Amino acid sequence: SMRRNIVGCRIQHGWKEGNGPVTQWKGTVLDQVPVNPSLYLIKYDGFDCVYGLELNKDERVSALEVLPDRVATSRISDAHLADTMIGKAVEHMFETEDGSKDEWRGMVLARAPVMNTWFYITYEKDPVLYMYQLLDDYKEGDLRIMPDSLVGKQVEYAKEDGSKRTGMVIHQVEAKPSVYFIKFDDDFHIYVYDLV
């Protein structure tokens, strides 16, 4: 029945998959999904993806603890660049284990909630939700901007494979309304798809 509002809170919890040991996780709750309020979006410390978990319902979660810690509010370093980067196609430079350069095409989706200096981004070749402090990358020349309802509905993604994935559209990107977030039943990532 009763639940506290945990958006903006730091949490820690255990996680158990199958027959493995419980593993320990610490993160920040970014959002509670309006079309499915059981579903929270979480950024875990040291992991780049944004995850969707039904924190209070998922039997894989244990020992859920809400900390009193307050996430610090910083003002972003360049409001203009921050605002105008939203919705843009980008080339985002990474380097890999061998130390060689590795450029990924992506799209900046939104400022992250809660963690004020972070941005939601997704990639052509890895279309799940990521979060980074992209102004840092931009300043270093590692992020270049390229020149240029369904929400709440149950959908499925069909393959030539023959099987399909079932999920729900959970968000429409304000800056790019043809783009949506999807939560699939079998998966804790948040998928990003252009549905027009």
Partner: peptide
């Protein structure tokens, strides 16, 4: 540049 994290699963 940032390092890309190892793919999970």
């Amino acid at each position: 540049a940032r390092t890309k994290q190892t793919a999970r699963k």
